[PDB]
């Protein structure tokens, strides 16, 4: 039985980058050929492994992390990057063994008047550790006076929305991203 | 004749932060008392000069730089700051002699459905030098292939709009900012 790469790549709805969606793939035959013939991906970049020798090695688990970001910040998905989507939403380790795949989804994620269902974390006290997610919506104390959940002056709500519309530039349109991290440990 | 501080502070429309508006005030009696009684300012911070001894010193020119930013980035208007409004839109020197004044203008700059007339520069090749403005709208080559004004993939339009609406948080609402820099040179 082939590993499911049509329920991760061809799914109906993707998760926001702050609450990204991790799926552990195991106990199957990893048929990555589905990613070699697909001509929609705008980025297929492999770190650690060669992008054609993914079949040769046998791994314990393959974690597919899927989310939706903008076109400007697809480059922030890589080892040793900084930004708003690289230390507050999704952080990759400095020694990463996996592959990042990103393709334009303006025709799925952008509706008339704006699709404000895709949020991203703008404020956070400290940078994320690799492969950590934060789904908290607590008020960010950006000043010097405790907020206690009122969201006023110098107390901002962290989760800012994405203004995706079909008229945006190709660099401001929604890109769907899937990060396949290959995890190998001492086990079958 | 009192120096004009009602055509800078009480003007009808403010300029965007990227194309900020500089007015040189000279040949008048600097009556800063209008700024001591005004109770609307949320920030009145003076660097170099004491905020009450502004009358005692006699300066050659007073440059009032007015613009509109968001509430999150009013703190980026200060000597030795970094961000998107501190090295791409408006940069203050490390040895600054002046005063920054900022007040909330949600009831003037935010209309129903959004006031997208206030732009800010998001992309730039190099950081601004102190007291420099850039009003160019050339396409930003963020990739490795020259754009030549097409605005496609990895070629972004720098000027991004502000989504000001009356429902935003007090930290996401439009703040009007006026920076009075005191310039003294050997002259009357």
């Amino acid at each position, epitope marked *: 039985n082939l590993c499911p790469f049509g329920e991760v790549f061809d799914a109906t709805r993707f998760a926001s980058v702050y609450a990204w969606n991790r799926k552990r793939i195991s106990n199957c035959v990893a048929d990555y050929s589905v*990613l070699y013939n697909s001509a929609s991906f705008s980025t*297929f*970049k492999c770190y650690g492994v*060669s*992008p054609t020798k993914l079949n040769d090695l046998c791994f314990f688990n393959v974690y597919a992390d899927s989310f939706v970001i903008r076109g400007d910040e697809v480059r922030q998905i890589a080892p040793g990057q900084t930004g708003k989507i690289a230390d507050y939403n999704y952080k990759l380790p400095d020694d990463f063994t996996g592959c990042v795949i990103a393709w334009n989804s303006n025709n799925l994620d952008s509706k008339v008047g704006g699709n404000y269902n895709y949020l991203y974390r703008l404020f956070r006290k400290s940078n994320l550790k690799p492969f950590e997610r934060d789904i908290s919506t607590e008020i960010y104390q950006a000043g010097s006076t405790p907020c206690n959940g009122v969201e006023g002056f110098n107390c901002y709500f962290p989760l800012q929305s994405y203004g995706f519309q079909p008229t945006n530039g190709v660099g401001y349109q929604p890109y769907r991203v899937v990060v396949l991290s290959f995890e190998l440990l001492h086990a079958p | 004749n009192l120096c004009p501080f009602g055509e800078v502070f009480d003007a009808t429309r403010f300029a965007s932060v990227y194309a900020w508006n500089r007015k040189r005030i000279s040949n008048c009696v600097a009556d800063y008392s209008v700024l001591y009684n005004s109770a609307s300012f949320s920030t009145f911070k003076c660097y170099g000069v004491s905020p009450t001894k502004l009358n005692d010193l006699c300066f050659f020119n007073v440059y009032a730089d007015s613009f509109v930013i968001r509430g999150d980035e009013v703190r980026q208007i200060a000597p030795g700051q970094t961000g998107k409004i501190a090295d791409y839109n408006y940069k203050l020197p490390d040895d600054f002699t002046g005063c920054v004044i900022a007040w909330n203008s949600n009831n003037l700059d935010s209309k129903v459905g959004g006031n997208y007339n206030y732009l800010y520069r998001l992309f730039r090749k190099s950081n601004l030098k102190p007291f420099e403005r850039d009003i160019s709208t050339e396409i930003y080559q963020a990739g*490795s292939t020259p754009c030549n004004g097409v605005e496609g*993939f990895n070629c972004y339009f720098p000027l991004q709009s502000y989504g000001f609406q009356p429902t935003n948080g007090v930290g996401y609402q439009p703040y009007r900012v006026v920076v009075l820099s005191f310039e003294l040179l050997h002259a009357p």
Partner: nanobody
Amino acid sequence: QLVESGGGLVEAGGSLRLSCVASGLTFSDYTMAWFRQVPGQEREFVSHIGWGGSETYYADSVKGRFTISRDNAKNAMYLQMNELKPDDTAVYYCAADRGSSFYYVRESEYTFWGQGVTV
């Protein structure tokens, strides 16, 4: 960032050796490539070499002629050209990216880029 050397008028049948040194990166985690651009046409792809050096790819017009290689003891890569027909005179760019793409032909898959070589 990416300095490069070599290039110049040849005797149309001899050899040449372009080289590309990196001066701000580890060069042990960076996959390198060589592109070529002629004025009046898009930038072509010359060759590509992943980490270590055992994984090399060449264009379908310079296969067999050019030899790509890399040396980590001085942070350099080399494109040894051996035929130099009168149709490959162009600017030659050196590119380096942290990862190894399946579309190694695409110039958008390389973050850092070097200067240009003589035409």
